[PDB]
Design a binder for this molecule. Structure first.
Ligand SMILES: Nc1ncnc2c1ncn2[C@@H]1O[C@H](COP(=O)(O)OP(=O)(O)OP(=O)(O)O)[C@@H](O)[C@H]1O
Ligand SMILES: Nc1ncnc2c1ncn2[C@@H]1O[C@H](COP(=O)(O)OP(=O)(O)OP(=O)(O)O)[C@@H](O)[C@H]1O
Ligand SMILES: Nc1ncnc2c1ncn2[C@@H]1O[C@H](COP(=O)(O)OP(=O)(O)OP(=O)(O)O)[C@@H](O)[C@H]1O
Ligand SMILES: [Mg+2]
Ligand SMILES: [Mg+2]
Lengths: 403, 403, 48, 39
């Protein structure tokens, strides 16, 4: 019954958050708690994401003077992962210690409030087609609709993210994708088709866009403060589209082709041991690349631009055997942990997609640089969007009746 | 308390409108009511916008075969306005009758259902810096904020449209502008400043964007059906921004500089005599052009693109003495009827702004083509956005207390 | 299947080849054509 | 060295008249030209 106007988010309209940030930094600076660079007990060594993040927040001024970015994780030595928690600093060039004045040289140990201490590591960094049967099946040669299929609007293309249902209201069923398909401030793009739009080829009509989100304040997302700049944002892309009432729902499958059956979503906790996420193996199935595997390297990467704005990213992933993890047009695919013994695979993330969503880093002197990819957490996005995931066909039918 | 997600309009989700359109055209075609081309009584000659619009809707197939567009109004003969209602058809070139085959030639009389009849007129048509004290005052050299002032976001600029207040809720006070400033699917633009954004110069913070609208279905806007194409839209640009609670409201004025005091908004009725809008004189005050005057020529202009989509525009205006009515960057200014005797001026429209918002038309062979401008109706936009206009400072203060 | 048959046919070229489930009856092509005199032939679809 | 008008006559020569003669406009699938002479 509402009129034809958009509504804007109301979660970024509180000055109490800014006042709390100012008070927090003021009382942190009041409690400097100086200590001599003496023996540091091993009992207060960091063992979680929270400690590293708060240490990085405390010492955010000296680290940002000569840097391109920072992150947290393990220390990398001679191209292989260690098991020592550390803060990673990214530089354009790595030089010998003899050509550095004392100001530019970085310390090897950092300490924050409460006596907690960690290491420092230096990495070099940069901020700048397949043919098979599976790719053909995903592009319109199959008889069902599921994860990895191609969806389209009047201009662009995309990959179907997941099959979901709403938590409130009438509990309607739909799918989750990326908002790029739905650019409706300059031209109408609000209908979805598979595999092609009407003015390019044959296809079938799926539904209309209902919800989307791009930017969230870090205080809501993480729950804590992670910077001093008043203007901070976190990128969280998403869009939800419900199924039309004329659509034939007997052609929908909940299986991920090329992997099998999956379990429930796995939540990332900021107080678990560090080895439950760093160093694990992951895999994906994408529309323009097929099946690929890789390894997770970093978490909570930070970037700063020339207009005084800070941005954050959640997951950093690197491919295996000098193979790229993903291509362009694969944005919106699931990121799933591989099963090691017994249990079924569980998804943890989603490929974000953008313009600076990739780049190069160097680990060994014998070969060239390698590529890296960014990813967005899934549980927090589902909580913000108020949606739930469906993993079995029996539950799919039960939701179909119960609507 | 809501999360950080946008909401989309829910007014374009009914198939009953499409079924009603199909049934309406079916029963119109069933009632062909043929009549010989004989004597037509003058009692059933059209005298309103409704008759012309329904006649154009009925005969929309033969007119669109060789045309660029159509409109309704008066007949133009030898470069001067007549007083005979007519439908205007736009062509690229005008030729003698000897080089036309019978199929291409257009009739001189059209008749619709019920016996109502009108004329046909042919026009040639095309679809493709000031220094003074007032311009300096409007750009930051004055001591007050009002209509015509410059407002800015992190990329673009614009003109302040009007001072308004909301109808529901707590009845908050703000201003009305165009949505282009608020392109927030690719980068954050949600704060407003006068005269410059922080990363370009000095300025003061005004508020944050709350509402916007671009596209409306013609069935809701006009109330009737005006075409056969299933996919039709009407452009209605607007955006509403409320004042922040830290802003000093003693620096706001309700006077239009260079004109004086204005009255209440004037509503355009589709059953009034045609001479109350066609042929009147109008004026505007704009940020990059100053004070200008012009004449209204047409209404309800229709356009069709290569992707099978139809668009409508409300007002067509032509400048006087071969002078352009407006420049680029003047989008968002008011269009006001000049007072002829006694009463105060009243606004009727707003300059739309876009890319194809201007062009050339030819009237006389002695001179070159002239430019034209498009405009959007105000009363319907206010009804859709649920806002009211303030014209006196006493009422401004009364609303300030009553909030 | 990428190999030549020995059955006379008329070849039609399309931009994309899709499954039969996503096609309305109007767009779908027949498998047999017949002309004047009763002569008949097949229809084949190729991407191009 | 080796390296737009508006009037009644120009309009008559471009298709507003009732006859064909010297100065009239002629065209092909790409370009335009002027009629040279009657021969
Ligand atoms: N600002 C700087 N720019 C460039 N190089 C720097 C800078 N500060 C320190 N370095 C150099 O970076 C190196 C630090 O390497 P790092 O801390 O990663 O050691 P590591 O992990 O034990 O060894 P590896 O090189 O095998 O990974 C030193 O050679 C130091 O001189
Ligand atoms: N499809 C067409 N394309 C170009 N010219 C056309 C077409 N159909 C008709 N015409 C020409 O357009 C003219 C119609 O002019 P119109 O109806 O505007 O007359 P008017 O208003 O009385 O005269 P005026 O030319 O003085 O405005 C005729 O010369 C007719 O031959
Ligand atoms: N307009 C169309 N656009 C796209 N695909 C179409 C169209 N009309 C039919 N098709 C599909 O094209 C296929 C016809 O294939 P074809 O006639 O070449 O079969 P075939 O030669 O026996 O098999 P093969 O695929 O092994 O060469 C069917 O799957 C049909 O659904
Ligand atoms: Mg190292
Ligand atoms: Mg005329």
């Amino acid at each position: 019954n509402s009129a034809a106007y958009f509504l804007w988010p109301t979660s970024n309209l509180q000055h109490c958050a800014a006042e709390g940030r100012a008070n927090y930094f003021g009382n942190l600076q009041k409690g400097l708690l100086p200590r001599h660079p003496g023996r540091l007990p091993k009992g207060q060594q960091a063992n979680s994401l929270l400690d590293l993040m708060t240490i990085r927040a405390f010492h955010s001024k000296i680290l940002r003077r000569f840097s391109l970015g920072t992150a947290v994780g393990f220390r990398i030595r001679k191209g292989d992962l260690t098991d020592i928690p550390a803060i990673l600093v990214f530089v354009a060039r790595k030089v010998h210690k003899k050509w550095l004045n004392p100001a530019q040289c970085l310390p090897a140990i950092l300490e924050g409030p409460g006596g907690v201490w960690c290491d420092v590591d230096v990495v070099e960094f940069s901020y700048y087609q397949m043919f098979s049967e599976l790719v053909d099946k995903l592009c319109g040669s199959d008889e069902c609709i599921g994860s990895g299929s191609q969806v389209a609007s009047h201009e662009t293309f995309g990959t179907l993210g997941a099959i979901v249902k709403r938590r409130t209201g009438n509990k309607q069923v739909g799918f989750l994708t990326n908002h790029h398909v739905a650019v409706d401030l300059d031209y109408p793009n609000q209908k979805m088709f598979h595999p092609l739009p009407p003015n390019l080829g044959p296809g079938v009509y799926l539904g209309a866009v209902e919800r989307a989100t791009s930017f969230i304040t870090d205080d809501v997302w993480y729950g804590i403060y992670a910077g001093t700049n008043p203007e901070t944002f976190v990128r969280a892309d998403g869009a939800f589209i419900p199924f039309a009432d004329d659509f034939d729902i007997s052609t929908v499958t909940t299986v991920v082709r090329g992997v099998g059956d999956i379990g429930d979503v796995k939540v990332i906790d900021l107080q678990c041991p560090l080895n439950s996420l760093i160093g694990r193996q992951v895999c994906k199935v994408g529309r323009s690349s097929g099946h690929t595997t890789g390894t997770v390297m970093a978490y909570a990467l930070e970037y700063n631009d020339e207009k005084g704005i800070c941005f954050f990213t959640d997951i950093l992933v690197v491919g295996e055997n000098r193979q790229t993890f993903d291509l362009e047009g694969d944005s919106g695919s699931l990121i799933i942990l591989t099963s090691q013994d017994g249990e079924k695979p569980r998804p943890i993330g989603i490929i974000w997609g953008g313009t600076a969503n990739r780049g190069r880093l160097k680990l060994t002197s014998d070969h060239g640089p390698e590529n890296w990819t960014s990813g967005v957490d899934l549980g927090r996005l589902l909580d913000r969007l108020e949606l739930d995931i469906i993993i079995t066909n029996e539950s799919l039918q039960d939701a179909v009746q119960q609507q």
